[model samples]
Target: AVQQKLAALEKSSGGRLGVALIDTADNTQVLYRGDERFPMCSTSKVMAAAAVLKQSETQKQLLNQPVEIKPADLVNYNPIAEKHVNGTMTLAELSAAALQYSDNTAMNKLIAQLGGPGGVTAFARAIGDETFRLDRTEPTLNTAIPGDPRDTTTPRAMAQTLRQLTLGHALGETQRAQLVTWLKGNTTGAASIRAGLPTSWTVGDKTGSGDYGTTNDIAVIWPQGRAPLVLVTYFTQPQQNAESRRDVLASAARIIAEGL
Candidate 1:
């Protein structure tokens, strides 16, 4: 029933929709187009931030370190980064901006700090997610050309990665906690999956929007007395000018929650 509803939703949207839902407590999964590629967009920021947190494990002072944001670093859709130009924001603050606000400049800066796209890819590999890849920075990353395969990840891979980071052993408890804190405070996901969840459920998510009508939301949700669930939804259409259709994600979430 859930799969049929999702398929109908995709048909109505005239696009591809990928979804992965995992019950962390029992490891049961429901996947649709789980292995197909979809441009990651800003949804990759969470992994980039996690890489920084991994570095902090040994560096000790990495998070507290202050870094200046220059005008040259600014790029498209950089709301928070534009405000802090010529000023310094701590690495921790930058991580928050990247994850919570999806600030393009903040993400680009973090990518540079991680030695570019390859570094984030390495981090993903280290965590046993070989299917997750990052090959470009923002703007270009958001290009999301159909079948291009650059900067793309599958729904299953993303959900698994989220599971590792949030419930598995990807980061230290403190770093993991901080990452969840930022995700919980995200201001960009209200209209996505979060919108469909019950008020009693605690939800934390990261959202991404890009060309080719790409829009995504990945989350860690906690029901009142249940353990937790990891959900990933990626939607895309061939027409670059097509609408994001975030309501599809919300509708999918509603179906998943109701069935659960």
Candidate 2:
């Protein structure tokens, strides 16, 4: 029964849970409940925004290619944004607020316009996430690098990069429809995992918050016909911001996205 309510919400947070679901039309339902090497703080920016839009469309450029959000692209910035003199944006709106408002200054200014942070980990191994990689200090120029601000993975390598972004695999269908239209402008806060669907179901995904006891969301659901699901949830110790801990982390993402 849905892995017994995701193993009772990962043993109600004695901490350690990993879920991996995929069904791009038929395959994937893996879940684990304990340290799958558990580091991932900023849900590794949806494979670094699909490897910065497949390395900016394999170099034929222009993901709305405008730029300029200076102050040297706001490094190590932790939400103080009010500094915009030349704050221009358009690597598709900084990959849609670096995957929907997890904007660490628009992901270190697109990780220095995707040529830093090992060019978004070499475009996540040229679009297939060949075991994703990136060691620190290239965070939008706020320079303090070393490694392991906890960016590790495994739930079978994020369900094979959300099953190659649901079989549109590596930006094929005309750049995966402009990369799910920049992942639906970064799936806004209707509350985690898009508050369990049903607004005529059209949810795309991307969500990542950090070390304040992480809570995750990596969706790509399409409920109505029941044929698309890649809901990766990763939560840990999350409580202190207590509004009943954001309604028990939005009731564990509306109970595993409207009971899967």
Candidate 3:
């Protein structure tokens, strides 16, 4: 039944949909086109945040450090952080905004502090992601580089990364708790994965939307009295509207939740 529902979702649009819903209590995973790679879009921010948190623990003062923002640092998509360009914000503040608000400017700045795109790629692989890539920062700082691929990851890889986070793998308990707090406050994609979920369930997720019709949401969900589930959904197509793409994700998430 789940397979039929997910198949129609793929056929209705030109893009592919990848989903991985893991029942943590028994270590069972329900996969729908889950092996395929898709653009991580802003969902990649979760990776960036996790990587930076590791760096923060090592650097000690990394989060408290304040960096100046410039007008040129802002990207094309961020609606929240751009207004504060030419100002200074602590690295911690930038990280929070990037996660909760999908602040591109804050993300690019945070990536820079994390030692540029190479650092992101290295950290991504270190966390068991085989196909994830960080090609360029949000603004594409240099025009010479064609940021065609954007960040890409398989649902399996993404889901595993989230699962590791859930088990307190990379970060200390404090930082891990902080990470969940940031994800829970995310203002973007509310209509997507969270729409049809049970009111009693609590979800901490990161959402991404990109060119060529990419939409993704990856999260750690805690349902009352049950072990948590790691949900990763990716959809990509040619010219698909963001709203409809998000609706597809919302409905799929609801179906999985019902069965859970």
Candidate 4:
């Protein structure tokens, strides 16, 4: 039923819409184009932050370590990093900024700490997510060219990775809690999944936007009395100049929530 409704929505959307929903209690899934690749955009920040947390487990004091950001490190859409140019922010601070604010420079700084795009990809593989990949840094990563596989992940992979990092054993308890805190504080997703869910539910999510009308949101949603659900929605238009549609994502989310 949900799939049929989603098909209708996609037909009218003028683009591709991919969705993945996982019920944590039973692992029951609802999918639409779940295996199709979609540019990850800033949603990749969550993985970068998680990779940093994974490293901190063995590197003790890693989160507390300070990282300097020079003027040249600034990238477009970097609100937090721009303010701290030539100054320093702890690894944990950078992680928080990246997740909560989608700070591009902060993500690039964290990527550098993780040994670049490959390091984050390695972390994804280590955690059993084979379909998740990161091939470039921010700004460039946001290019989101149509059909380009670079810096992309399937909705299924994104939802599963998100579930592992937030609710599974991928990270230590403390690290998982920290990641959830940052996601819960995210300022960019109000009009996406969160808007589609019932007010009684609580949500922690990361949103991504890019060229070619790409818009994405991946989240862990906790219903008032039931186990959590991980929902991922990625939207992209074939037309390069088309605009991202947050409303489409929200509507898709609403259909999923009601279907369940």
lDDT values, one for every candidate: 0.91, 0.59, 0.78, 0.94
After superposing all C-alphas onto the true structure, candidate 2 shows an RMSD in angstroms of 15.2
Q: Between candidates 2 and 4, name the one with more favorable TM-score.
A: 4
Q: Which 10 consecutive positions of candidate 3 have the poorest summed lDDT?
A: 140-149
TM-score for all models, in order of appearance:
0.98, 0.34, 0.91, 0.98
Tens-digit lDDT track of model 1 for 1-260: 98898899889888999999999778999888999999999999989999999999889999988889999989988888898899988889899999999999889988888999999999999999999999998879998899988999999999999988987889999989988899899999999998888888889999999998898999999999998999999999979988788888898888788878
Candidate numbers sorted by TM-score from highest down: 4, 1, 3, 2
Output the lDDT of residue 111, model 3: 85
RMSD of each: 0.8, 15.2, 3.0, 0.8
**TM-score of structure candidate 3:** 0.91
Residue-level lDDT tens digits of model 4 in 126-172: 99999988999988998889878999999999999999999999999
Per-residue alpha-carbon lDDT of candidate 3 for residues 145-227, written as tens digits (9 for 90 to 100): 12244567778878888887655476778778878888888887677788758878888888887755667888888988889
Error of 4 at 251 (Å): 0.4
- Regions of candidate 1 where Cα sits further than 4 Å from its true position: none
The global Cα lDDT (0 to 1) of model 3 is 0.78
Higher-ranked by lDDT: 1 or 4:
4
The Cα error of candidate 2 at residue 162, in Å, is 4.6
Pick the winner on TM-score between candidates 1 and 3: 1
Give the residue spans of candidate 3 off by over 4 A.
Answer: 139-150, 240-244
